[PDB]
Design a protein around this ligand. Sequence first.
Ligand code: EIC
Ligand code: NA
Length: 281
Amino acid sequence: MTWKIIADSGCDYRQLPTPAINTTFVSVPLTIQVADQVFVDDASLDIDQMMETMYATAEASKSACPSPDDYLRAFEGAKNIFLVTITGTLSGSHNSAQLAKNIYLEDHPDTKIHVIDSLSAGGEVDLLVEKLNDLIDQGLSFEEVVEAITAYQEKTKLLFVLAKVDNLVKNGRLSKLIGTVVGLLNIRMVGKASETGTLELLQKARGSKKSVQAAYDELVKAGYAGGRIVMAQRNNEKCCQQLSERIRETFPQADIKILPTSGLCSFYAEEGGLLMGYEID
Ligand SMILES: CCCCC/C=C\C/C=C\CCCCCCCC(=O)O
Ligand code: NA
């Protein structure tokens, strides 16, 4: 009776804290191409060297999603499989995962697989993976877990704050329309994952302290009530500690984690970026 939780590198975990029994976690890396060099976003990756190279290269850098075959490899040795991808609207990760599922079940019929399009990235995907692990530790059946995680995904949201969005624009994942009005000269984009898995603007905040206030206000407005938060950040630990204190001051039971971004999430959120997943109602 074996379980695998699979996620692409839009999830910031390389290791899943305290995996449930008979459960293994696997991250499936996306890639980032900088000139004629390729960086694979696995735990071997020196994220700091990749970013330095990217910013040093006048030519735009590009991301790519996992092959279906990459997903097929990850399935091996498990009978109960959940696969969470980054938003299938901005990346083909989910499309490859959908195909891998259908291909594997031709080859290995006594297997159960549930593919979750997070419609998100970063901290919210992290929460979903943590919850899947929770649910398995709790002793649920495969179909019980599918039910509970579908419900939990209605309870989870994403807020981001980005000081730069150039790589998003350069890669066609954010319009020049929105892209020019933020991430330029003291203006950080405060946004959420939209109902379709896209970037949606919420506030422009001029400076840090205004960035924290906006993020706190948006959390309140969205219906946070003291549950779990996962803040995935790129060189933004100080803004994350000051936001965390404020949230804990208001909601004393808050369970907050701060994680470094993956290579993919670092690439797109960029320096100073934050992708905060959280629970509501
Ligand atoms: C909907 C989530 C929006 C999050 C916005 C904030 C920061 C962006 C950081 C990570 C998300 C990147 C999404 C695009 C991935 C493309 C991968 C590919 O090449 O296939
Ligand atoms: Na959600």
